[model samples]
Each structure stands twice: as C-alpha cells, then as structure tokens.
Target: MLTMKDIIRDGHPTLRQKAAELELPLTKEEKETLIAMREFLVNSQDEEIAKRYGLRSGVGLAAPQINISKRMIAVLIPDDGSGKSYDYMLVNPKIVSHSVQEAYLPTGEGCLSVDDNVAGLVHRHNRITIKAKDIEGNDIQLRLKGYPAIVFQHEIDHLNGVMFYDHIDKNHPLQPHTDAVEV
Candidate 1:
C-alpha cells in the first residue's frame, strides 16, 4: 500500500524535471504503480483506511511524485462541478486542445507532493480536450470542463514538471484573472 511517506515532497528534483513518455505495453512495475496509485487515492479518501495508513487525501497522483519519471497519472474527482465522477489511470496523457477562458476554484488547490499551503488562485483552461491511453493500453479521449478541467490540467502539468502555483503571481496571489470564472 502507498502511504504518505511514499509521496515525494516539493523541491524533489523530479518535480522540476519533465517526465518521459511511457512506451506501449506497460512493464510489470509500471503497471503495478498505476494500480497502486488508484488504490492509494481510494484508501486516502476512506476515513478508516487513511487514519490507519497515515495517508493524505488526494484527487490525483503522478508517476513523478513517486520517483518515476514517466508520463503517468491517476485522478479521482468525486464531483466534477457536476454530479458525475472521474477516476482515471492515464499513461502518456496530453492536452490536445484547451479553451481560451480560464477557471479556478475560489478555495484554491492542493497537492500530495506539496505538503504546505501556498495560497493562490491557480487558474486553468475552462475546458480541454485530452488524448491518452488507459491502464489497459486502450486509447481514450476526454473533454472536460469546470472543476474537472482544472483537475486534469493540474495532473498533466506534473508530467511537464509544472506546479499549480507556478503560474500564480506570488505578489498578488488572488489577483483577478482576465476572463476567468470561478468554479
């Protein structure tokens, strides 16, 4: 089981370095890592399980955060601004297109890799079109909007070594974003 200790902290070299693309037909360890990531998210969200394991609740997990520099991520959005849910284990994920308008959570965002709070309105594309492979190596495309869009953007940025606050203006953390709407 993946615990809080398994999560890498901020300033880890891998977090700043762009991850490499994964090859088709995943390896044994790679496949296992993907599976463990989703399981970790589920456990972390469970009251009893997270208490026993000392796990931090998170909606997303990336390979780079676990000392693997591969383009892989796991996301679990219980409610994506809608009543729907999104749980995915993506490999070589890419944002093929995005909207001009931006969206942000009024409450801001968090990360398992970033243990401390860095207050900022992390704005992201209001909508996005992504293409990637599922854990089973099947191709899939997703069109996400609202909170779900922000969620995917956050995770995909991890693939490129970008942090949520990287785009925020430190001096003006809550500064208004042009054409940006709150989620």
Candidate 2:
C-alpha cells in the first residue's frame, strides 16, 4: 500500500494540469495514502501543512491535494460548537447539481501548493448535491450546505486542476487572511 506523500508544493505542474478520471476505486496504495491524509488533516488540523505540501489548506482536503490526483477527499467540519462530530471521506465524488445563486463565504484560504499570505474568498454554491462512494464502495448521494459546500467545491476544483486564486478577481479579490487558519 502506498503511504501518503506530502502534497506537492506550488509550481508543481501536476497541480495545474487536470487530474485523470478515476476509472476504478482507490488502488491499495491510493487507499493507504488517503488514509494517511485523513489522519494528518483531521488530527493535525494543519492548514499550513497542507499548503506546504501543495494541498488546499481549507477545512476539507482531497487526494489530489496530496499529489495522488485521485478521486477522493477527507472532510472535517464543525458539526456543532458543542462537540458533536461528523467527519467523513468522499470517494469518487461528483457535484451532481448546484444552486442557482453562488455562496460567498468570506473566509481565509491557503494551499498546499501555494505558500504564504493566505488570502481570497472562494465563492461557491450555498448548497451542493454529490454522488460518490464511501471507502467501502457503497453508493452515497449526499447534500451539504455552508462550509461543507465550500470544501466540496475546493476539492472538486483540485480534481480539475483549479485553485481558489483562479476564481478570485485580481483587482477586486476577497480580503486576504494570514493567520494560518483553515477555512
């Protein structure tokens, strides 16, 4: 099985190039890498770490961020400020549909590939519908709102070789935050 390698850093051509379609479920090596990424992202909560590795330092991360360019992601969101938990993995995820209006969550953003001065507002759908498989290969169609939707878009962008910076307006971009916090 493949161990998760640190995400590739900025300037890696792979991060810019489109990821390949996932014809099959995760390979043994890919599964191992994704597991490692989940452990690192969920427990460490290290957005900067993700950026250093060329990953999206947002709240949720995907396989492409770690340089595997696979069709998968691990997400951790605030289920409740009171400590309820609902973290998960989305394998072979696809945004089946999107809302008509875009959601603009004015939060800080960083990247595993891009470094320093984390700044930008990633406008995404307020709601999203996804069709994916769990690690077990079970079919899963899920709906998400707020932060989860943002994370979903981010990871999906990575699959197509897109980054938040690409979405931001150069002249009137969202304010930048530099606290090394995950959005």
Candidate 3:
C-alpha cells in the first residue's frame, strides 16, 4: 500500500520536472499507480484511516508528486458549494478552455508536496474545461468551477513542474485580489 511516505516533498527533482504524458491503454503498472493515487486521497479523507496512518489530508494528488513524472492526477472534491462532487483520475489532462474572470480561495491554497502554508491569492480561472483520458483510456472532459476548479488547476500545475507558490506575487504575497471572486 502506498503511504504518506511515498509522497515526495516540494524540493524533490521530480516535482520540478515537466511530467511526461501517459500512453493510451495504460499498462498494468501505470494503472496500479493511478489507483494508488486515487485511493490515497480517499483514504486520507477517511477520519479513522487518516489518523491511524498519520496521513496528511489531501484532496488531490499528481503523479509527479510521487516521483512518477507522468501526466496523471487524482482528485476528490467533496463539495463545490453546489452539492456536487468531483472524483476522478485523469491522464494527460489539459485545460482546453477557461473563463476570463478569476477566482481564489480567501484562505489561500496548500499542497501535499508543499510542507508550508503558502500565503497568497493564487487566482485562477473561475471556470475551466479539461480534456483528458479516463483510467479506462477513454477520452473525457470536465467542466469545473469554484473549489473544484482550484483543486484541478493546482494538481495540473504539478504536471508542468509549477508550484502553487509560483503564482503568488512575491512583492505582495499577502495582498488580497479584490477583482478575483473568492469562492
């Protein structure tokens, strides 16, 4: 079973390398990795399981975070404020379209790879359309907004070797983005 120890820290080389795209009809090993990533998020959210394992809660996880350096991500969004949940594992995910307006979490953002709480309004598209391959190798697209959008974008950034803090304005790291919607 992959545990929290399997997750790499931010300074790991794989976290800074642009992840490679996965091939269609994922091999058995690749499929297993995806399943592990998916379950890690699920288990981390389970109260007892997380505590027993000392797992740091995580809503999303990307392949690069585990040193896989592949374009795969697993996300489990319990709620997006509309009574909807987003749970899926994506391969080679790409943001096909996005809104001009931006949104950010007023509380800021955090990542499993990042050990510290990054202070800043990492504003991103309030809405986005992502195209990717399903775990079954079938094409799929997702329309995400609000919290789910933020989670997806954060995980996707890992595939490109970009850290969440990279989006924060260094000079004004704690400045509020009034123009951005806080959802």
Q: Each model's C-alpha lDDT? A: 0.90, 0.67, 0.90
Candidate 1 lDDT over residue span 34-82, tens digit each: 9999999999999999988888888889988988889999998786455
Model 3: residues with Cα > 4 Å off, grouped in runs: none
TM-score of each: 0.96, 0.78, 0.96
Q: How many clashes would you count in candidate 2?
A: 10
Q: What is the per-residue lDDT of model 2 for residues 1-183, given as tens digits with 9 covering 90 to 100?
A: 122246576677777777666555567776676677667665445566545554343456767666776677887765568464547777878999977656666654566556665566766677789998877678889787666677778878888888877877676576433431233
Local error of candidate 3 at 126, Å?
A: 0.5
Q: By descending lDDT, how would the candidates be arranged?
A: 1, 3, 2
Cα deviation at 73, candidate 2, in Å, is 1.4
Root-mean-square deviation of every model: 1.3, 5.8, 1.2
| Count of residue pairs whose backbone atoms collide, per candidate | 0, 10, 0
For model 3, give the 10-residue run with minimal summed lDDT.
172-181
Q: What is the lDDT of candidate 2?
A: 0.67
